[PDB]
């Protein structure tokens, strides 16, 4: 693997590592200070919101004021944000650290995507998007895992490690990385609605489950951060392995819509089974398979986007990234507040959004069948 490609992918893996580092720490943060779940969700919600807000301005700066400089500035800002979070005292300083880290993440991603586009040839676009989605997430899953796993001996040393990794990535990028209008008028805008809704639902469900599992297993089974970390990382590993081993086999049998509907029904059934779970090992094993549905949905939505877009793969990738970020911003904000409303209410919210996804996909299938038979 090229060295520059490795550095560029590390710049995203570490960014999503910092994105996910906060979830396993939520229970001790609730206990030691004393708040509601609304603030715990609002942490990640504001991080994703800042990332989404900064992404257009960050991309404009990267295109105009140079690409490498913006990437380096974002990396140093991410390291500074991690260091500040490692030394926080109250809710306001953590809020500011999350906001500035989100801004750094939103100023890094457009630069790295531009570097990927400008370095690899034009015949490696879909593959570049595929790897991009695969790292962006193999990081959004491994973040909470490593953070909770290593947050057992110290209360804030995971953020110190994140800052050290940011400094190392900045140094390595400085040493190694070197870079010496009418496009929206012709868009139909009436056909991308269903994939947009599907990817928004998937991102919202993933983020909502990420917050809700931690909050609910802390409230009910008094889970330690290490237990939550191990469960999350094991579920992510299982989902990734099952996807990479069976996605082609399921794809070669049925179409995308029916597969998505059955996967959503499976997600609902695992959520319902998790409703009545009351034992440590029982809920751990149930969580071990929840991520399977989402990790099977994501490549299906990516393939659907690639097929529906056609020649404009870049526009599809941008829309997918923007709507995934919006879902990640809207998930925890609702999830934590409604958990504060009721402990099991976020589970009902997740099953409701899954039902909305399954009904919209089934009506899109009905429409396709109607104009196919007509």
């Amino acid at each position: 693997m090229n060295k520059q490609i490795f550095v560029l992918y590390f710049n995203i893996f570490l960014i999503f590592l910092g994105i996910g580092l906060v979830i396993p720490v939520l229970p001790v943060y609730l206990k030691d200070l004393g708040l509601t779940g609304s603030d715990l969700g609002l942490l990640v919600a504001a991080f994703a919101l800042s990332q989404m807000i900064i992404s257009p301005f960050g991309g404009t700066l990267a295109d105009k004021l140079g690409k490498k400089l913006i990437i380096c500035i974002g990396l140093i800002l991410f390291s500074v944000s991690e260091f500040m979070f490692a030394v926080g005292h109250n809710f306001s300083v953590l809020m500011l650290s999350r906001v500035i880290g989100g801004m750094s993440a939103g100023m890094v991603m457009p630069g790295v995507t531009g570097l990927i586009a400008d370095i690899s040839p034009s015949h490696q676009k879909a593959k570049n998007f595929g790897y991009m989605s695969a790292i962006i997430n193999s990081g959004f899953i491994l973040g909470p895992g490593i953070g909770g796993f290593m947050a057992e001996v110290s209360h804030r040393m995971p953020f110190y490690f994140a800052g050290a990794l940011g400094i190392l990535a900045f140094i390595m990028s400085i040493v190694l990385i070197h870079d010496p209008p009418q496009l929206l008028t012709k868009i139909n805008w009436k056909v991308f609605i269903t994939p947009v809704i599907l990817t928004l639902v998937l991102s919202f469900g993933l983020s909502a489950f990420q917050t809700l599992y931690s909050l609910y297993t802390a409230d009910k089974v008094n889970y330690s951060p290490k237990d939550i970390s191990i469960a999350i990382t094991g579920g992510g590993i299982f989902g990734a392995l099952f996807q990479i081993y069976f996605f082609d086999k399921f794809m070669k049998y049925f179409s995308e819509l029916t597969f998505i509907a059955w996967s959503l029904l499976y997600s609902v059934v695992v959520l319902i089974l998790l409703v009545f779970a009351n034992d440590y090992w029982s809920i751990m094993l149930i969580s071990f398979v929840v991520f399977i549905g989402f990790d099977m949905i994501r490549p299906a939505i990516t393939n659907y986007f690639s097929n529906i877009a056609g020649e404009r793969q870049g526009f599809a990738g941008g829309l997918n990234s923007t709507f995934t970020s919006m879902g990640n911003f809207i998930g925890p904000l609702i999830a934590g507040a409604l958990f504060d409303v009721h402990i099991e209410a976020p589970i009902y919210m997740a099953i409701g959004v899954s039902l909305a996804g399954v009904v919209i996909v089934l009506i899109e299938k009905q429409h396709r069948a109607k104009l196919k038979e007509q």
């Binding site: 992404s55 990267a62 400008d118 209008p181 870049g314 941008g318 829309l319």
Partner: peptide
Amino acid sequence: SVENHWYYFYWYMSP
């Protein structure tokens, strides 16, 4: 003539 400019939320490749 290869050069990518950044429109909103996405990178477009110059004609």
